[PDB]
Ligand binder design. Structure first.
Ligand SMILES: Cc1nn(-c2nc3c(Cl)c(Cl)ccc3[nH]2)c(O)c1[C@H]1OC(=O)c2ccccc21
Ligand SMILES: [Zn+2]
Length: 346
């Protein structure tokens, strides 16, 4: 539709005026990184080798930056927490981070305390500091009351991926078995995150998601020339913007608080697996391809089944995580939008 392309254009224009905001953020990040390196506990801190200082959780909020600080640590040993499949206690194989030990277990709260305290005393050099909920992001910088920067601490592990990822990343018929093998040789990450326990760490594969999104076709030259333009990334942007607009419209009702961009990005990767050919994503079929993403997301809400793309036993739409009414709420809203050609995009 012409409205979908209209939305994408405006999302693109609001993105283009950011190279000045990025430079600022990059300056604050390089400063905090040098400061964190001074402390003996965070000597191995750095950025994920993803090719960017930052990401944007919300495509409609170019002023809200998101940054991850990775921590190179000695070989980590992982104890699953309570069959949650994605949350773990962190331990050291053999006897620098010893100050954060609560016995044999690496303490997230003790490491969060020092991380936050160090960044608190460093923003005193037009930047205030704020802290939020969960454990991740750990802190939130506020630059000139116009730009926010969420910062997440992440432990880096070069061990093999956890057992719960064994049947995930089902890209073999899309991106190939060779690629899946290469990707699973890369490190994984753990972010401090409470489990509904205060000292757990949650797996993070955001760096793998980025690699897939930026190298997304069956053809190695997908989107590198005019003959091979697909609408995969445009469809993901529209799904993100859809959810972002619904959460903004219903922010003062409760039923959408448990949904996030992680849910639409997960459902999108499943649709890429279901439609592995570049010819199922021709730029001229944007409206049909976007509709395919909407209706797959609805099927997930109705059946209350949204498997984590990396950890297939973790059901993101589990009753234990999101109440059946909330999913019925969102199913209704999306059906309404679909049936009325998406007023939220007007
Ligand atoms: C970036 C991100 N990744 N991510 C995620 N959720 C996962 C689940 Cl549920 C399983 Cl089972 C396995 C792996 C998961 N990765 C997730 O929720 C988020 C958002 O929330 C955060 O932590 C956060 C912090 C800063 C910005 C954005 C977010
Ligand atoms: Zn492409």
């Amino acid at each position: 539709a012409s409205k979908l392309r209209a939305v994408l254009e405006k999302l693109k224009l609001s993105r283009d005026d950011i190279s000045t905001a990025a430079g600022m953020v990059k300056g604050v990040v390089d400063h905090l990184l040098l400061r964190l390196k001074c402390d003996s506990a965070f000597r191995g801190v750095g950025l994920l080798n993803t090719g960017s200082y930052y990401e944007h959780v919300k495509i409609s909020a170019p002023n809200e930056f998101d940054v991850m600080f990775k921590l190179e640590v000695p070989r980590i040993q992982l104890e699953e927490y309570s069959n949650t499949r994605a949350y773990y206690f962190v331990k050291f194989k053999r006897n620098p981070l010893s100050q954060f030990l609560e016995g044999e277990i690496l303490s997230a709260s003790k490491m969060l305390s020092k991380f936050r305290k160090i960044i608190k005393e460093e923003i005193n050099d037009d930047v205030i500091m704020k802290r939020k909920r969960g454990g991740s992001p750990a802190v939130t910088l506020l630059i000139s009351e116009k730009i926010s920067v969420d910062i997440t601490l992440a432990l880096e592990s070069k061990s093999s991926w956890p057992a719960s990822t064994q049947e995930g990343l089902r890209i073999q018929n899309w991106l190939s078995a060779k690629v899946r093998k290469q990707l699973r040789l890369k490190p994984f990450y753990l972010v401090p995150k409470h489990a509904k326990q205060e000292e757990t760490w949650r797996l993070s594969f955001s760096h793998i998601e980025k690699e897939i999104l930026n190298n997304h076709g069956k053809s190695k030259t997908c989107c590198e020339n005019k003959e091979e333009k697909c609408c995969r990334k445009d469809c993901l942007k529209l799904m993100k913007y859809l959810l972002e607009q619904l959460k903004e419209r219903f922010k003062d009702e409760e039923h959408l608080d448990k949904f996030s961009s992680y849910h639409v990005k997960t459902a999108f990767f499943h649709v890429c697996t279901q439609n592995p050919q570049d010819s199922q994503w021709d730029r001229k079929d944007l409206g049909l391809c976007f509709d395919n993403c909407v209706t797959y997301f609805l099927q997930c809400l109705r059946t209350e089944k949204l498997e984590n793309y990396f950890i297939p036993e973790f059901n993101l739409f589990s009753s234990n995580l999101i109440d059946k009414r909330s999913k019925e709420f969102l199913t209704k809203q999306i059906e309404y939008e679909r049936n009325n050609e998406f007023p939220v995009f007007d």
